[PDB]
Amino acid sequence: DEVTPNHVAIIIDGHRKWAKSRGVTVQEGHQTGVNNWKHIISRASQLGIKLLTIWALSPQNFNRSKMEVDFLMRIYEDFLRSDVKELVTSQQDIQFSAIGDKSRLPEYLQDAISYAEGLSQANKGMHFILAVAYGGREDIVEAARKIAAKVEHGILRPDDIDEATFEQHLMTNITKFPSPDLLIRAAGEQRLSNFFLWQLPFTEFYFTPKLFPDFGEADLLDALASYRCRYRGFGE
Amino acid sequence: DEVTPNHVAIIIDGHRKWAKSRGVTVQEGHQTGVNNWKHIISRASQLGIKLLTIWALSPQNFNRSKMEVDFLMRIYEDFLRSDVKELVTSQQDIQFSAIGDKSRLPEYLQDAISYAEGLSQANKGMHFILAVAYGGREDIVEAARKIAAKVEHGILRPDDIDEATFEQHLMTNITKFPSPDLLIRAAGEQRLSNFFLWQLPFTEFYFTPKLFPDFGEADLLDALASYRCRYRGFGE
Numbered sequence A, B: 001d002e003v004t005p006n007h008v009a010i011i012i013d014g015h016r017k018w019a020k021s022r023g024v025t026v027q028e029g030h031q032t033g034v035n036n037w038k039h040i041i042s043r044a045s046q047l048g049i050k051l052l053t054i055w056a057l058s059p060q061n062f063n064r065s066k067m068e069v070d071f072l073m074r075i076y077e078d079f080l081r082s083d084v085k086e087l088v089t090s091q092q093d094i095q096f097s098a099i100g101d102k103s104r105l106p107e108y109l110q111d112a113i114s115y116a117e118g119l120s121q122a123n124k125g126m127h128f129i130l131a132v133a134y135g136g137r138e139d140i141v142e143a144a145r146k147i148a149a150k151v152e153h154g155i156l157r158p159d160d161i162d163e164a165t166f167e168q169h170l171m172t173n174i175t176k177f178p179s180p181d182l183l184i185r186a187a188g189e190q191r192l193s194n195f196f197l198w199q200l201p202f203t204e205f206y207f208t209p210k211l212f213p214d215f216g217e218a219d220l221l222d223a224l225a226s227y228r229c230r231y232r233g234f235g236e
Ligand SMILES: C=C(C)CCSP(=O)(O)OP(=O)(O)O
Pocket: A232, A233, A234, A235, A236, B011, B012, B013, B055, B056, B057, B058, B061, B189, B191, B192, B193
């Protein structure tokens, strides 16, 4: 229904603050966060959103402690193995993709991604992108490299490079809705932290102080209601 | 002083809402807005900010009425002819540059830019960038084209393309602070509207409901105070 975004993206944050707050391990913060994802993806599907992207891991995040990063990777494998398998085989019929530098991930996580993508390859329901080892600068540079390789091999001239060409070489080339209509960021910070950059020229931003382990279906609804109250003029 | 941003950027907005609100012409809205710029640039200089960017005109804005756009162009000529001439010849010793697709502008505005840039070429004070006919997508594509031309002529291989190389071909290559530390947007909308994109992976965003004709030195101070209260973790 028109006032329903095609693409919603979410930046998860606030997991350690939440753990600190509740006297509990950061790992428990992360696990309680990841447990919210399935209800959010269900909700977005019911609402008629066409693509939901959840950003789970930036390149910068690899500079955290080894054990924190390894626990995240394991939780994501588990998420892809249970929750995602349930979503793509439900009547929601979700299509699953992962975007990012998947070569940086543990082989097991790469395999779990392959499995979930293969299992959902023919599905026709809402697309769900898990962005993992995904950074917006890195996307742009890698697009630039792919375009330059084509120029090197004669397939493309420099003056042929336009928005649309640049767009077809990003990691979001797997969707016809690469640009989010609505970007949600949990935990109160007002910054992109090297998420999408090319993708965001007209995206509506919604920032909630809610820490992501507390973030549920009602918080998605709240962001959507803010969205419907926005006037989008696109410069003109 | 450390907690002072090197680069502050401002998105001006809310001029027609302000005019509507006060029963006055949109053109008067725009002129009252542009009259605020000099006190903002002075203030940023006093505060030890190293670069202040004011975004005045996007490519999208060219889809407004002819007369609105022509009035903006004339006001900008006048700003560059009086206010900017005063700033660069004051003891603030401001260095003036314009960024954007300057070929799309009226020759007279192009000449006014040339004059102010030439007059300030040797200055050592705060840099002031006026971004005019500047769009973030357009920046990235034009960088991509310049890099591809170099690849075509053998100066660069595709695997040589890294962040830093990509950065030296954007329109912000004129500063050593291309990425704003703090981005201010007046008038209550929470979106970039095709301003900087590459430039913004870690920029702090500050959104004020104040309509830009009401925006003064205290509103800069308020954004700076919010800035100093932000915790910046850069992913790690
Ligand atoms: C081009 C600028 C100086 C500011 C961008 S705000 P503008 O009104 O042009 O664009 P939208 O609010 O997205 O409609």
